[PDB]
Design a protein around this ligand. Sequence first.
Ligand SMILES: [Mg+2]
Length: 221
Amino acid sequence: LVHGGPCDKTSHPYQAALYTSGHLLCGGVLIHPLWVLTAAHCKKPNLQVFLGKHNLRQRESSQEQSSVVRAVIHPDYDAASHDQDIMLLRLARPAKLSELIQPLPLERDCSANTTSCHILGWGKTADGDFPDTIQCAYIHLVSREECEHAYPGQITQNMLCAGDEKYGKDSCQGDSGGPLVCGDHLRGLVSWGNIPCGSKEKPGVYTNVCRYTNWIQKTIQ
Ligand SMILES: [Mg+2]
């Protein structure tokens, strides 16, 4: 995440870190004791899920690890256009909850008017390096008209744009699958966007979570 800053230690209990080959690959969102929601492009064999993490370089009393017993990628995910970039990860066992490990409710209403949101992750920062401490940044949802104007012919109904015209705060490589939180509900998942990262002109594009309430519900059931 570029142009942001370190998150408060107790503000991201729903944040999951996804690892493979010993390195962080993506972020994810705990939406149920047995399920972590993330981006479909975070699919890799032998994913490791870490909950209750804040600083990657410090062993934290609240961190819990888990293996993935099953990964459900959206049947219509398209890795070229990024359409339907969503995947559900079933944990070996239900997550143990506490102040630092909690699920995040999904935004079911696509017309929700809460525009001031925030993103977070351990992805690449402005200096081009990967932080040990998770980063946070507040951004705003951008109208679909402006979204489509920035990315003509590349935005589908399954995508939502968000960015920061002042500092260009934006998600980046490594933040993929992480949450776009609006009004205490999950509004989107880090999917793709401008490269180099920065959202002043080209806003970040997120998976439109409100569109998948039925699919997720049916999958967890
Ligand atoms: Mg298709």
